[PDB]
Amino acid sequence: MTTNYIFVTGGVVSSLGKGIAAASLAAILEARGLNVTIMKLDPYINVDPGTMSPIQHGEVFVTEDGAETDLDLGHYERFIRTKMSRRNNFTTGRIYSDVLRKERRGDYLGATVQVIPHITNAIKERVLEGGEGHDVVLVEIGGTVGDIESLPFLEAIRQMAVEIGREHTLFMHLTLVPYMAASGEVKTKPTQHSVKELLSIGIQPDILICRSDRAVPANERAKIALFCNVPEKAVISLKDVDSIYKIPGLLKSQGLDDYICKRFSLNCPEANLSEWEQVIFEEANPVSEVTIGMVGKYIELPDAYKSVIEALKHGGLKNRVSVNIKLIDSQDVETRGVEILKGLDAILVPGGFGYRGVEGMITTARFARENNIPYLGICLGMQVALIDYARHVANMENANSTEFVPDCKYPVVALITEWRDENGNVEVTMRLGAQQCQLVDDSLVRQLYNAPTIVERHRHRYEVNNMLLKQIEDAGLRVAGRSGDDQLVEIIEVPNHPWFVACQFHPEFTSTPRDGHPLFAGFVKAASEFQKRQ
Amino acid sequence: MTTNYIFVTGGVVSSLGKGIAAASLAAILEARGLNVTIMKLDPYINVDPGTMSPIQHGEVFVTEDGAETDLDLGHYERFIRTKMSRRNNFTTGRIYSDVLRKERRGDYLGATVQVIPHITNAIKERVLEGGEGHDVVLVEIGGTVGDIESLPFLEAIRQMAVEIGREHTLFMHLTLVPYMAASGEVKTKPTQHSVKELLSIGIQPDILICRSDRAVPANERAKIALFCNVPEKAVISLKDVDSIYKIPGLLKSQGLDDYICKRFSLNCPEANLSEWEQVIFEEANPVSEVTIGMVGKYIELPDAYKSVIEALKHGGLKNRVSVNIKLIDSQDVETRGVEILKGLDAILVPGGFGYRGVEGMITTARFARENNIPYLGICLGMQVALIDYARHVANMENANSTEFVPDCKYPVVALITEWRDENGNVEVTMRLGAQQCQLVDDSLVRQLYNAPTIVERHRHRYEVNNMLLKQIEDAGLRVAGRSGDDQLVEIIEVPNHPWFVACQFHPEFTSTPRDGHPLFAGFVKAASEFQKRQ
Amino acid sequence: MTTNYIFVTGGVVSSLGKGIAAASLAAILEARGLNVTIMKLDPYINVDPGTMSPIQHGEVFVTEDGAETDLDLGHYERFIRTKMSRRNNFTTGRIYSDVLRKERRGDYLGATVQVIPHITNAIKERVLEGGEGHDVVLVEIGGTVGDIESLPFLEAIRQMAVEIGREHTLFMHLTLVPYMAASGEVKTKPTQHSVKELLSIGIQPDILICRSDRAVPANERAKIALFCNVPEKAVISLKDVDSIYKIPGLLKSQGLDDYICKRFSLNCPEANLSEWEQVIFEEANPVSEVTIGMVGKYIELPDAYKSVIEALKHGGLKNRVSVNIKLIDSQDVETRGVEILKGLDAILVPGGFGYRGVEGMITTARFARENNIPYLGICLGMQVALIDYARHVANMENANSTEFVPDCKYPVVALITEWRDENGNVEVTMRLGAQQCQLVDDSLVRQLYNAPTIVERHRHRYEVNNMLLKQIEDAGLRVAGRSGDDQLVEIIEVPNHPWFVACQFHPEFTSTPRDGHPLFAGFVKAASEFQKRQ
Ligand SMILES: Nc1ccn([C@@H]2O[C@H](COP(=O)(O)OP(=O)(O)OP(=O)(O)O)[C@@H](O)C2(F)F)c(=O)n1
Ligand SMILES: Nc1ccn([C@@H]2O[C@H](COP(=O)(O)OP(=O)(O)OP(=O)(O)O)[C@@H](O)C2(F)F)c(=O)n1
Ligand SMILES: Nc1ccn([C@@H]2O[C@H](COP(=O)(O)OP(=O)(O)OP(=O)(O)O)[C@@H](O)C2(F)F)c(=O)n1
């Protein structure tokens, strides 16, 4: 049991799919019975993505231990079974924070603290912490080789390779081999210049992953093999694909996992990708089609809802339904009205913070409730469902969250500390990661999950006000799930409806293409049944 | 009034004297009536030198505003009259701290924080903050061009030069032009390779400062001029010198200040270096010689006492005395005895923290007191003087500091909060920077300073215990200076002695070669008078 | 067995002694019974040094096959017994000539001829041609790594290392580790930046040879070992020495030959350096001293007479005489007269072309003959001796060479085709390399060489005119050596003299420190005997 490291770097351009490639290779190695994990080194100065806005960087992924991480850890969990944690993602910001704090504690004992060895040591420690206890660890280095921002990471992993040796380390380098119409060929010159930059910081690549908008022919792979001084079988073609689920198969067909198993002296059986073959087959052969509207406030960057979009596609796979996801701005509902929600087979309202676009989401939940259009609300999606039912069925005028209108008459959503009733009477912190939720018997979700208890991941501050709940319950709404000693509301259902479910937790973070998700499967099934009735 | 910047970089090796060169050039420009200042950008991760050990990095310099800074700010204050502050020195550590904290306050508004532009912006802001309000600002970049650690600094100052323009910015690059016996010539090839590294990060030097162990001939300067595409008058020879006081004259004689005044369109009169000429003359023509023992715990790196060594040399200049400074380990006095203090014309005990070597310093103060050898104690040097006089004249057995022996019977030195008497009765934070001190009339120091009040700089925690003082005063010791509402003891004198003075403050930080220092002048005079009597 | 290659490169500066170090290592390896050779790759565009002026490049060394080569091949032959040929030296000029010629002969079959692979292939072919059939081949790359001029050489040897493998190739990189008074240490930073330059062109050094004006301490070699990822025993200190004969011993004492033999899996006995120890002992323990004047037209650059200066030193070793070589400009004899030839124990006039300073050499030959000062003339040195004698003893007025005065009455020196007598009556180009010479009985040289025939190396056009020889022989001059069918004069003597010999050939090219040379041994012995008589 000696841990092996595959360092995954990128050259020429940023957007090579380093994460997908690492995840896809991990999927193959896992399918050979190996204990594998992946970690992402981000060269940004942000301590973590907690502060980073959804419409700049994309969604904040949440691990079961409650870490706020890069959305790439979503790819990782959707390609391998090994659970991600805080240890599988860190930034330059985290590393400098670690070192600045170690300096205050006087751990450096009056020494001058330097990029080498102090910053590089801190990086190596975190890679080893995340890596050890595994057969193979894939380490994705963010950025493009040659840029300033990744130089400490590259020096760190260069040092690791010298210490551990070439028997238990590989350098896998993604590169752009672009097509020029003028020459009618793909061009290796960018790979030549990129590999030279890599050599100049003391890294020799073992494996070249050649990204292009078409196949990189054997002739160009042979050229790249010579000038990089690697075997031709270590030069892999990875053309643009219509589905990332095909990538493990494409890499296996070129023997990449065989090459890695030989270099690391791992005797393991052939990769069984039958689950991926099944996923590819399902995706290629949908029986029917549905249009599902996603109504939120961050649609200007789709990656803001990355895991939700994937969870809907997984819902499609399990029902053999093709899902046409229509991203709709909730502010457009406020101004233009509910005319833009017409022609939808189902409606999803995903998570969010701040009041901008929330009123449109409340109107959207009303439209879906009154017109019997299948509805799934996630976090904020549950809040607007509760506000709708409180306002329009329990006749609680201007019911809202304390997040949006702090001094509202009926704060049906509020922090536990803010909980008050309509007269101002009282009783007597971000919830993050995995928590057990108890499901109410005879509820739709109890049926779908087929268990009394489930584990789903949170990222929210504002809870359902239990002081105003019974009034909403008596007006017809049903509590389907609860959690903890405070008996916090986790899931609500509207029963006089074909399919209406809203949850506080983020089920999208537990959905995979191979195992799907009970809520998303149920939701997409309802969308199909609705479409058939029209 | 448009502020001009001279960016001072170094190539080939670290130890080119970038600070001395910057300070020496500043001295010339100041002697032309210009408002000039200097700042040091350090690529270490240490938030500031406060934590850095004296026997690794050298002395912690203290500005009047109480900043703990690089010893280079000592060079700056000894070459120009412009006072240094916190703004004239910052590290990579400070810059990352600034940015990490701005991220928490949400000043970046959900943006991805990047080396460019966020780290480079933070660097530019601090350079502008320290620079603006001056005719010429010299910005010393620590490190060697081509190293990772200085890349953000070099990108920052490259950006500044583009924005401000070539009319108000210059790049001054120090380089090594070494002599090879084999070729019998100095070699420009290192300068060629260094300048290429500079070009590759988008900086073209305006001025080449050629360091060698001998003159760089016109022939080699002409070669460097062509391959750097600068005028030959912008290629300066700076050979190894026996005295740094000569460097302003050597640079002026090659027209460097004329070149800078033309490039910045500054019409100012010829530099009057008559004060530097006087310093050089004094240093070259000492009338007599003295041996002064410096007894401390950090002698293994002389730079630990950099400003004290310079202050003694300045004492020599003002008395026309050559001072032979003998660095003596205080632990050698503890083991080998006072035999190693023989042949000294005077004794100095400088500042320090921790008990290691303190007992030797107490014995050293006793030797100097009993044998009438001129004594100067600085900070710890005053503590061991008080402990000596308390133990051996006031018969206070085992009198000590609470820093060294917390539960001692007579804590003659302690924190204000720890102040107790011998029976345990009571009454009823690092002191940093400039503080007014009141001088007692008929004291030696009142005579030397010739003023009732002085301003000197502190760097100490532990004070003289005023509860045990009167007992030491009545045993003959005299309080010569005090400060503040707590009437803290700043200066003590033993009067039955030719010259015995010890101060809490660090007078070495206010000494210059041009103006000297009253205490050091008096001390070195006493050392000469003692030597004549033997 | 498989031929092993040591590629010898240089960083930081040109003048590291790459040739001396390669030659000194070859001497250690030859002493271990290995078959070793050395070759020099010069990045100049000159087809060969035959065109290059001696005051620009230094001496044109001549191999036994008549090749005009770099003076480094003189170092090679003075350290190893392996004979150099045309194959042991080529330039970029030769490589481009090779390729341009092959192109016109249609050898490339209408292909585009490129730096890679056509120029690099031509370099590799010539390195193999000189190397194959030896145990170890040392390949010296001229220039400084990072310069444009050496990039094709470095790419060629990089390719060879990939093909041949790490089992039979080593990269030995010389670097400058300069001392700084400011730091009181030698600086590894230039080696750091030079090695980064090597890595960027795809070469990893195996051995670092650290040049400095002093020993590079264990601490500094340890830093270099870590940065370069080489073992500490592969980092060698080579300080400046008084004698190059010590360098084999300094390298052996640090185990360099052991490391090379281990890497190449050569089992050979320990080196016995007794021959070098003896040379060092002889050099360190002279018995008497002499001053020998070398009177020529190229003294501006001493390396113009590299092999002659070394031959005189070797003559010193054999006689236990310390030789003070005084370089005298022959043009100074024309202006200031024979005043400057005073206090010389012997006179040597070396080789040269063109009339400038020749009349000064004729005056010098006359001075030495008339005042019985031991004389050795080489090539031009023989011409001026023959001219002196013809003019001043045989009374042949204005006797000269057709090279200098084509239409002179008495062309005593002239081309074979030009041979005429005083009346203009006739009979019915460059000589290069080793030729047999027949020595005359009862001549001084017949005794000294102790053989009837000798082999010496030529580089000359103009011969002794046989049509005017008889007349000069009748006047007392003796012919001591002849060659070929034309019976060309090789050696002349003046018997009415303690020691007066002059030869057409260059005896300095067959002199070594271990074996010496009979002519130079005799010349220095005569200079000693003359000094004792004064
Ligand atoms: N380090 C190097 C490497 C190569 N070349 C030169 O590069 C030239 C070939 O460059 P091309 O015509 O663009 O072709 P290609 O390299 O195959 O690149 P692509 O895959 O994008 O088509 C040779 O003359 C050379 F000479 F080989 C060079 O000058 N320096
Ligand atoms: N970028 C460059 C610049 C120069 N050179 C080549 O560098 C060679 C000259 O290098 P030297 O003999 O060491 O001399 P020097 O440069 O004056 O350096 P020093 O001052 O240390 O003596 C030319 O043939 C060249 F060709 F000019 C080069 O190949 N690439
Ligand atoms: N590629 C590199 C390598 C090092 N350094 C930085 O280089 C700094 C140390 O450089 P020094 O003080 O000049 O010392 P030295 O390297 O031992 O060189 P010498 O042997 O000439 O004294 C570290 O802070 C660093 F950070 F390690 C760097 O920034 N980039």
UniProtKB/Swiss-Prot annotation, chains A, B, C:
Q: Cross-referenced CDD domains, in alphabetical order?
A: CTPS_N, GATase1_CTP_Synthase
> InterPro entries attached here?
Class_I_gatase-like, CTP_synthase, CTP_synthase_N, GATASE, GATase1_CTP_Synthase, P-loop_NTPase
Q: Which reaction does it catalyse?
A: UTP + L-glutamine + ATP + H2O = CTP + L-glutamate + ADP + phosphate + 2 H(+); L-glutamine + H2O = L-glutamate + NH4(+); UTP + NH4(+) + ATP = CTP + ADP + phosphate + 2 H(+)
Which processes are annotated in GO (biological process)? Answer: 'de novo' CTP biosynthetic process; pyrimidine nucleobase biosynthetic process
- The positions annotated for binding ATP are S15, L16, G17, K18, G19, I20, D72, K239, D240, V241
Which residues does the annotation say bind L-glutamine? G352, L380, G381, M382, Q383, E403, R461
Please give the pathway this protein is involved in.
Answer: Pyrimidine metabolism; CTP biosynthesis via de novo pathway; CTP from UDP: step 2/2
Q: What class of enzyme is it?
A: ligase
**Glutamine amidotransferase type-1 domain span:** 291-533
Positions of region (Amidoligase domain): 1-266
Cite the binding residues for CTP. S14, D147, I148, E149, K187, T188, K189, P190, T191, Q192, K223
What is the protein named? CTP synthase
What organism does the record attribute this protein to? Escherichia coli O45:K1 (strain S88 / ExPEC)
